[PDB]
Amino acid sequence: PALVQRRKKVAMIGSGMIGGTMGYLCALRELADVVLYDVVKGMPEGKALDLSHVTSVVDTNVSVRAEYSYEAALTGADCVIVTAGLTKVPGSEWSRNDLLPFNSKIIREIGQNIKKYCPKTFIIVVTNPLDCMVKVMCEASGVPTNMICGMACMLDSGRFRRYVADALSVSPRDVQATVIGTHGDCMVPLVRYITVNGYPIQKFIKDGVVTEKQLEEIAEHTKVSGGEIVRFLGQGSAYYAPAASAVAMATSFLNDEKRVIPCSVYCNGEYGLKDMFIGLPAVIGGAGIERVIELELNEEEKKQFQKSVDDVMALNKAVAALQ
Amino acid sequence: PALVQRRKKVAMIGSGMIGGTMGYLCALRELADVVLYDVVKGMPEGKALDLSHVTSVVDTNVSVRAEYSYEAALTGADCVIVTAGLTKVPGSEWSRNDLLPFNSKIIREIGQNIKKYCPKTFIIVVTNPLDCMVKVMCEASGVPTNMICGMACMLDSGRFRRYVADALSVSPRDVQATVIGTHGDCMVPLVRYITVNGYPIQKFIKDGVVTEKQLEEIAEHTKVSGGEIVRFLGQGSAYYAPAASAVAMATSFLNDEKRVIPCSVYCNGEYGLKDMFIGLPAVIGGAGIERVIELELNEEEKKQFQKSVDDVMALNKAVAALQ
Amino acid sequence: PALVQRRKKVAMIGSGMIGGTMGYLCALRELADVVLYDVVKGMPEGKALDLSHVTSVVDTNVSVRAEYSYEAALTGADCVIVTAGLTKVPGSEWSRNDLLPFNSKIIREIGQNIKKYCPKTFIIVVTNPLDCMVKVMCEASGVPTNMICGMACMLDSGRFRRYVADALSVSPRDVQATVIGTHGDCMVPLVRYITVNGYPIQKFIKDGVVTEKQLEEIAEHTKVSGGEIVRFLGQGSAYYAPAASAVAMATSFLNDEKRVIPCSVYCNGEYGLKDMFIGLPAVIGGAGIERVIELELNEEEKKQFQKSVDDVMALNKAVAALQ
Amino acid sequence: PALVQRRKKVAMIGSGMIGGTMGYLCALRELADVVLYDVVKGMPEGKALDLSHVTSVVDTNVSVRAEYSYEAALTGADCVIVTAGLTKVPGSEWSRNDLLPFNSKIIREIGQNIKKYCPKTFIIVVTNPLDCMVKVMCEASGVPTNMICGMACMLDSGRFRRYVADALSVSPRDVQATVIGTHGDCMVPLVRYITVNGYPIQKFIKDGVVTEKQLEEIAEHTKVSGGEIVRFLGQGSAYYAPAASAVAMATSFLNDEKRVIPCSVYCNGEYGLKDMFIGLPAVIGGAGIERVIELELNEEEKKQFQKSVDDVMALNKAVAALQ
């Protein structure tokens, strides 16, 4: 008979370290069939076999396949997570003359193919410079603005929460700490908003549990966390947490969870921003980005966010100026 | 050879609806071997068999057994969760003359047996009136004050969060809402402290997402939630959420998670309270209650908490006045 | 915008102990939105509230609601699990004159309503006498024969596996033991087919690990397991394992897992049976029952299975003879 | 107060692709604190930070740290998983003159340090040539023979099961297929023993579902699966399934699950083998390897297993001949 319930399908456009790790999460949790795509022949097929073997070991059943053409990787994809492209320099210069032309071109082409093969998909961009690339993707793919976002701020917020959790000796599940803005030295970790299960951090400072300076050192540590890992790895960059972040976003969409996750989202009025994507707290459900949350920022926070804004507007102009 | 790694063991003293449901969570998650104890012969053995069968179905392996003597139920228990005793009236009168003598007596006896067979266990009391019974248990068992707590506020907070989550259309994972105090009409849901992933509820009110009155209706709904279920059930009371709550507390202890969970804890100075247990936010880790969090309460909050306090002090006097 | 990914929806027609426990599994695993239906007003609403509270506690987000009309419980249901009806006598007489008329009538009515509101659903019947009721349901609902089955044999097989697992000291995950036939003293636990991770039990007997007599005692224990629990409970029957069993079946369908699970399935040729449902090993995927596995039974096994067959044919005649 | 329940601790001696992936499984499942050790400074620290960030993202709390000295990596380790050493050639020559001296030396040193710092640990060796290295480790560490094993056959069996599962269209959870012997072209996939939830494959052949030749092609595919991935990757080898395999073994030990998993185990009599480790089905529980299962092998199977044996004995002689 006919297939009444089909498995969800997630297409990883890019099968380097983050793409393969995201495929691993899918196989481990039986979240969805996975297609690993890449322009470089070889890696995708070896990773897809290894991943198919994982299903046996952990007793799950999803199909993991490698595909090298857009039509086969994209067709039927409920969600597409893009990591394709050159990797940026930790924390402008070479990026404007080498990163930007190359990545804006490839993201645009991926979007044109999403428009062609899976116009109803939920797109999650990872490729940098993030906020800039999410706009290029939105324009090329033509999908509703609530159906595309970029993964970055959940990763930066996860780092922020891990450091605070160590300082307070609590599980990070119970630390709510958020970073908004764009992924670079420009990001804004909101120290003032930190809560421990909804209890403001100010009281923990008054009680001598942690000091203001300590929180600012944590905020600075969060900003340079990406580069710190790049330097230790020697080659490549972080992938375990970036993969878990993108997959948590994809899962909230696929299961209409309505999780609240900071991510690069489309603004039309919030924070006074128009027609642009930038990192902000959003609700992700079965209708994609269902709400962009507007926080009451104080003077200093507005000043740092403004910096993130100027930075995204400048890169977008540079992208337009290439056409 | 010798057993180097043994499974954790959780003893459910009381095998009515909550005790059996907690045993189910253990079997489903392969959390620990389970012993179902009760004074009424029959139910514990039927539930233990049903539960042993669950392990096959869900592919886990823990031992679920019924025991009717203290020595066999308690010996080797890493955690003991007590639901034994009469059930209170939803939201003083009959409780002072019937509930209190009966339950203070049985809790005291259970504690004397914990002192005898598993003095190093982590005790979680569920039996009502909660805060009062936790003190009786602490005195009878003689365990360190950080190794005993009572489950109630996590359940009340879970109700509170579910209602707010529906009002805001977000996953309750991302609603931090807390109830402190004692389990009755005296409980204090902290509406002012509500946060959505650490973002204060006040802004959501300003943005027209929810109104103040609506939040107060939710707070009132939270207070009468237990009785509402009792009335719909016709017989007995809630058990799915109370079981999940107690087990989440036990899991944070067994795995030293350091989760932040409101629960009845020992105070010596916090909020100005001494030698008593009352519902407050606490950190639960491998050393039991590792921190009791002191919130900055405003005038109105102090007034309602005070009410919870007076109520717990009055019941404790009534318990002492029985010896 | 429009909802692109909606949550699966499972309708529990019957909200007694098994229906509510199945709703609990759904809330705990974030498997699907749940509707608890029943003719008795009260229980469904109290259980649905308790279950909604569980989602907060375990950090998941699914909607659990009570419904008392067919149109609201059934509409949009991807899977319908029916436990409605009188409960049989452990392990013919009163069943023919009281159980059969009452349950054949209610199952027929539920099917007519499934035909009306959710003709594309996957139906899992639990109501006894199982195999008989599954045929009544198939005829009333009119759904394709691969889209209806009955839960029983997975429960009986789970019991069988738990006992063998204890005898061998291995996890039941690694015991493959199956019961085929109809749910009663007529069931057929296939002792000869028992395997430990695919290794035949005969060698374990040769090695002195377990004896033939011991396996037959386990087979007999499996046959009377339902009644044993009924006697210990005093009131009602097993529900934790029966719920986990039905939900495992529903999950294999909803996620197109293609698990191999013994369950009451439609035969047209297998084992020489035609137009009837009986307990056999089947593959459950996104197209429902995708394969009914035909085992090579020996002389003695055919004889005991035949007994199950005669029993199902006799009850079906008795059901037809009521119209 | 004192820590009563401490988290389990798993030391990954080797932090290349498999070691870091195993650390990821630990963080994702909150299985245990993790220490990533390696001789190469840099990678371990970057991977440990990335992994610590994962805990925030997936809401778990375990500590992931990098360590470069034996005393700090090993002390307190409940389980030690070793991947340190040169990687072999897919499917003798250079291995005898370069791989063997180098790896036998490093494994011996790791064992001497395990004897010194964590003599009660459960050792899982991954480093090749596997069976040979497990004996070197057993001799150097001095731990009871039931407390050391090698991971290989579960990976080979997982590959075998995935291929059969695709051929039959069932979840690999329900395919029991085993490979015994040593990890190389010498491995023995037991085609005759294949079962689908305990139902022999011979009937599926009779029913035309799969053919004998097809099963032999799958057996051959299983033997060359490691090399196939190496060739597609271009650099390095498989790691997702090898990590999941080792961690499944470690989990069965840490939680005394008593899973049945083929792995390199100590023989003293089984299959007529003495004082050697070779890949066989074993039960892994809280007392380590609790049973080595002896299968009734036919003429052809004994012949192929013998080949695995001769191969392991030859490498062991070559290892002794180096001292």
Key structural traits:
homotetramer, 323 residues, alpha/beta, Rossmann fold, L-2-Hydroxyisocaproate Dehydrogenase, Chain A, domain 2, 2 domains, six-stranded parallel β-sheet, 11 helices, 46% helix, 19% strand, globular, oxidoreductase
Brief characterization of the structure:
The structure is a homotetramer of 323-residue chains. Chain A is an alpha/beta fold.
Walkthrough of the structure:
The structure is a homotetramer of 323-residue chains. Chain A has 323 residues and is α/β, with parallel strands linked by helices. Chain A folds into 2 domains: 1-150, NAD(P)-binding Rossmann-like Domain (Rossmann fold), CATH 3.40.50.720; 151-323, Alpha-Beta Complex (L-2-Hydroxyisocaproate Dehydrogenase, Chain A, domain 2), CATH 3.90.110. In chain A, 46% of the residues lie in helices and 19% in strands. The first copy, chain A, has 11 helices and 14 strands. Chain A has helices spanning 17-29, 43-57, 70-74, 94-117, 130-141, 153-168, 201-206, 212-223, 225-233, 240-254, 299-320, and strands at 9-13, 33-37, 64-67, 79-82, 122-125, 148-150, 175-176, 179-180, 188-189, 195-196, 199-200, 259-268, 274-285, 288-292. In chain A, the strands form 4 sheets. In chain A, strands 3-2-1-4-5-6 form a 6-stranded parallel sheet. The radius of gyration of chain A is 19 Å and the shape is globular. The N and C termini of chain A lie far apart (51 Å). Chains in contact: A-B, A-C, A-D, B-C, B-D, C-D. Chains A and D meet through helix 1, helix 2, helix 6, helix 9 and helix 10 of A and helix 1, helix 2, helix 6, helix 9 and helix 10 of D. Chains A, B, C, D: This is L-lactate dehydrogenase. Chains A, B, C, D: Residues 9-150 form the Lactate/malate dehydrogenase N-terminal domain. Chains A, B, C, D: GO terms for molecular function: L-lactate dehydrogenase (NAD+) activity; nucleotide binding. Chains A, B, C, D: Residues 155-311 form the Lactate/malate dehydrogenase C-terminal domain. Chains A, B, C, D: It comes from Toxoplasma gondii. The PDB classes it as oxidoreductase.
